[PDB]
Symmetry: C4
Subunit: 274 residues, 4 copies
Amino acid sequence: MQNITQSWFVQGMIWATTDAWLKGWDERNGGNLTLRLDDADIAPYHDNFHQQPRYIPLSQPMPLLANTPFIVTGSGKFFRNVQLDPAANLGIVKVDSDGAGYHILWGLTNEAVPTSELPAHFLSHCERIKATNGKDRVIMHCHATNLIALTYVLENDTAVFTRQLWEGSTECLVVFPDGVGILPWMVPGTDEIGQATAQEMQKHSLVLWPFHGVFGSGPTLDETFGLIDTAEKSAQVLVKVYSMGGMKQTISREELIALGKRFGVTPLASALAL
Amino acid sequence: MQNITQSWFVQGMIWATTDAWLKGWDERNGGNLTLRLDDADIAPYHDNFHQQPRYIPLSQPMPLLANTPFIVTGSGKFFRNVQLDPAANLGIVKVDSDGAGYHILWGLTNEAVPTSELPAHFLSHCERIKATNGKDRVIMHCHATNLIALTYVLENDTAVFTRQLWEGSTECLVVFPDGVGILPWMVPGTDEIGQATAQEMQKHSLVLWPFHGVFGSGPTLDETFGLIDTAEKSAQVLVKVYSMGGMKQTISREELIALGKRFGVTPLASALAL
Amino acid sequence: MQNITQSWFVQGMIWATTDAWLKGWDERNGGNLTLRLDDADIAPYHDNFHQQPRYIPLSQPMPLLANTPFIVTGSGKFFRNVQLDPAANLGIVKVDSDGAGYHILWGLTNEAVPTSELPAHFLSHCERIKATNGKDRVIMHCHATNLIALTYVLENDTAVFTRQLWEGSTECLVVFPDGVGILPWMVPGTDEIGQATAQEMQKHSLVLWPFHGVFGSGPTLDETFGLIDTAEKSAQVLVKVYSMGGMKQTISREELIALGKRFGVTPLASALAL
Amino acid sequence: MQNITQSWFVQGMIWATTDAWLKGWDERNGGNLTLRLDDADIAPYHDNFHQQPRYIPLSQPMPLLANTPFIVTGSGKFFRNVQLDPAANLGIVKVDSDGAGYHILWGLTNEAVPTSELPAHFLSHCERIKATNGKDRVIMHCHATNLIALTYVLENDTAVFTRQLWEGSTECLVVFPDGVGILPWMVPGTDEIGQATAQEMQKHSLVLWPFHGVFGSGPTLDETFGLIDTAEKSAQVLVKVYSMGGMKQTISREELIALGKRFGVTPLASALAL
Ligand SMILES: [Zn+2]
Ligand SMILES: [Zn+2]
Ligand SMILES: [Zn+2]
Ligand SMILES: [Zn+2]
Ligand SMILES: [Zn+2]
Ligand SMILES: [Zn+2]
Ligand SMILES: [Zn+2]
Ligand SMILES: [Zn+2]
Ligand SMILES: [Zn+2]
Ligand SMILES: [Zn+2]
Ligand SMILES: [Zn+2]
Ligand SMILES: [Zn+2]
């Protein structure tokens, strides 16, 4: 066999955090990542676990997550460093039988704790489980540069921002037909931002935090990264276009309608009506 | 000997898709790549082939491709992932004796299929074989960032866009004297876009899809990548120039004429007449 | 055991200089880095030391640094090259018992000397030791591209520049609540710039040199790099925003106040009053 | 011992071409590089040489280069590929006893030839040998993106362009006090451009070719790359500044004078007088 560091999920967390770091999305400790696992994923490795797993209570219980293991990035940890020492910067946590707290089964060495945003990641996992009949398994936050820049110049409105993003690369309507939900600026790490993000996650796989960054959900690390990368690539194109004095032409409503029909998706009505 | 993963063509596909990924041209599954092989390339490795190669019919037969093997990127596959698992993300296909379909000789594991754009890649291969007396072997699509951005600000016209690209780096006229053919925006993955792209490929080695990306043809992976990289580098320069308020000076018609004479190329007349 | 090149501190210097090089912050010999060590760090490796450590006097003695070892980048050395040959490009120096000079214990082969800016790094180390009760251990200088660009377009004033940086990413107020001190342009490598930078370091962990670059202080290589990376990422966002015609909206004073309260920091009053 | 591929000079050529490729300066075959060697460099490896070195005549003899070996990039070769197969993409050439031609001692396999710009590189080597009493050993050409972009917006005049570059990063006056000589646009690969570049090399270590790229000279690969990287980094800053609507403040003549005095350099008078 092998050590847990060579598992598909530890190697996956490494690749995702490194690639996000390399894109320029995760300065310092900016960003966090949680992946919902099955018991079968971690089972072969139980003797690599901490002998006496630390328990941390959850302020709000999440019975929908009872008995569920996750691999998570740590609080104050750098995406840059994950590849260098996965055990120091990542943890495997398991929510207990009534969803009242979790045990830290592996990693987060030297008394590290999960991302301060864990109970918020958990709330969004809950809404995404319901919204997708258990398909979604990942919540990813990063400081995607061009998407951030756009929040200073575009109206911070779901329909308006979504429509520009759709225009900025042909694939975007196909990739996120439900659009990108945009919150008002909120104090990060608060219960209130967690709740508001989870509420937006009911209707969208992508949520923007003006002047701060993006939140994405998806079934796998690759698909979730890909989702955020698609929105950020469109944002990159838009920044160049706006910098050159704006669109002389663009993808029309008629074209977006034809696109949604061909790919069997229902584009967000408000964004499409503009 | 060696396994097929170490062949020049599998290693070539890996390098090309990775480099395109690293340039920022291939977010998510954006992009696709097909390379026409000879029987001699794949022959040493036949016992590595799937035991019972899956057959897929072609909607339109292509007898010009009868008996021809290709290595191709898979549908829904990420350029990012090719280096990690070539067999999962790439396939070797061989068109049958009457060009009615192809067998999947190798790769595309777990029921993966070639790029949904395979019959379109095939149509362009056909036109490029005819246009170059069999020299061209590669069709490459990617989401080249600056070229995309320019399609929102420049007139989407072959002559006009080609002329700006020629101006944006001295080598461009020498590298693509036949210019870049620009289609109207079209729904991707359709028969209609495949046909229109193949028609443009009769007269140009590079074709642009407004608000979406670029298509290039060439004799080798390196030369085809190089061709697209040249156009995208010129586009990068132009974006910076337009962002700084536009050209105060540029390469003149007189200079472009002198350049084409020295290098023994015939610049596209309409682009040169501007 | 191991050679000194595999120590945490030599490997740390390698990663920090390489990453800064990869970010585009350290063309040629642009940039310098010094890390304050303990005797326990270098002790195991004393027999790897130069047999007869070269002594260099300090123009101004620094008794606060008596007996203190540092690992430092060399004068005229390239950040790019550190990874290739740490011993050629890095040195371990130890300040003597009265702070009158230092011995070169290791590295800086072929008669290389520490960064010409060593006595200035030392002055800032002194002010940062006092300002943080010995917590700070690193002084890092680099040519952070977007921060440089901003010094041609923003008022070069501590309060004004700090406030824009806070606005340019939500985390910035939390990461540098004391702000970024901005000096007038000064001739580099002079006693005068060393003194002025050290004076600014009394009140700020980050100091800008208009038309030149940034200086940061912190307790570890990672945290200091992270600090500079945070300011530069905000600057990158601001450059894009200014390029697109400026802020239509931004983080308000009210929001910054709420942010500082939640995170338990006191934002620089003058920057906050704007 | 070792094979020639592990020599300092083959490894140096690899690093220089790869790094230039990674910076985005060398799309396709854009760019070329020649390094003047001594007989002592190549001597240990003579039995690795081609058995019967191919001879190529020089159109104009260069007796100043008699008996001199060089390692060079090949014609039509990609900087990207050098790391993959140095022998295919690089050659060691040795100019014969009267400077009438050269033998290809090593590399350029499969009938490859040195950069079509070899006799031009050679002419500049000659002028740089004279200008520096034999210190300069490298001629490097690349398609440095931001420097190219600036040639569409700044006056293509030595004094004017040099002065902006000096302003764009404090170190530039110190690094190239003699300035950057700017030619008119010329047809590349011609005798005329070779001559004009060599003439500019009498007075400058850096020469710009509008709408095309840069040429640099220096004593080592690192120092020459560093020289070009410095000018390109300043150009990058200037592009951002011009994109944000231009300089509100900048490095003054008075400051540049003070800078040149401190560093013991004589700034180009015409650029300084502006
Ligand atoms: Zn965040
Ligand atoms: Zn067990
Ligand atoms: Zn919504
Ligand atoms: Zn596409
Ligand atoms: Zn067999
Ligand atoms: Zn056409
Ligand atoms: Zn500096
Ligand atoms: Zn000892
Ligand atoms: Zn201050
Ligand atoms: Zn060139
Ligand atoms: Zn011999
Ligand atoms: Zn001159």
